[PDB]
Amino acid sequence: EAKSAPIFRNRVIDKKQLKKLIGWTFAHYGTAKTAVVADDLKALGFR
Amino acid sequence: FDLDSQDLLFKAESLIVNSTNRYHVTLQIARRAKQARYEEMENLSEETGIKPVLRAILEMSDELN
Amino acid sequence: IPPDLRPMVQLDGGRFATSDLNDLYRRVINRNNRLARLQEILAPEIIVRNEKRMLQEAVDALIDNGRRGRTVVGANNRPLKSLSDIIEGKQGRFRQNLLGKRVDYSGRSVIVVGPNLKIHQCGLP
RNA sequence: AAAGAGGAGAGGUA
Ligand SMILES: Nc1ccn([C@@H]2O[C@H](COP(=O)(O)OP(=O)(O)OP(=O)(O)O)[C@@H](O)[C@H]2O)c(=O)n1
Q: What transmembrane ranges does the database entry give (chain C)?
């Protein structure tokens, strides 16, 4: 649920990178943080 | 209210994680909720503004401390 | 069979509804009564065998229609529904009333898109 | 107190 810091992805972000990020978040933090992360990404993309 | 659904989601996730079977913990929560509802219905009035299942989740998560 | 599983129904203003089990039961009863009456008065034994054959065919049609010979046809050229047609196929008892059901406390409506919602939330009219 | 019973055709929407 903690103790892992995200890496700075200095590149272009397509669908594959988003799927990789979602998998990493689920594997490292749990099933409750992933929903909020997906919601934030959806809001940013819509904006 | 000060209690949002996000806290309940985290508490439920914590309850699921710290156990060996999800079906067993679901049955335990259901039993506790039924007992709490029966206790409420026959005595006093209590803080009725919370459903029995949410109450059972709250007490069971607090017992983990 | 009990009479409440084959209802008569009182629509049509002056007439009555059609049920298929009742017709087959009536035919069986009619043939049985005719055969008994013929046997009582010592009829010649070339007419009795005819009645026996028709009784056998009537019972066969009641049990399973069209399995052996010709099929019994109602008013229009449409075969009747026997006892074996109630439990047989996709519209039979097993696959229609036992493995699936209609339920209470249910609704249905069109869906639109709601942004600004949370992933565990929905909007109900 | 009461209130719809089934069946058969034809045409549509995910
Ligand atoms: N015989 C059919 C026809 C349609 N469907 C359902 O309806 C959908 C059809 O969706 P539709 O909107 O007609 O087409 P799409 O493939 O979604 O394409 P688009 O919306 O871009 O036109 C199918 O995927 C399926 O879920 C079905 O189950 N059986």
A: none
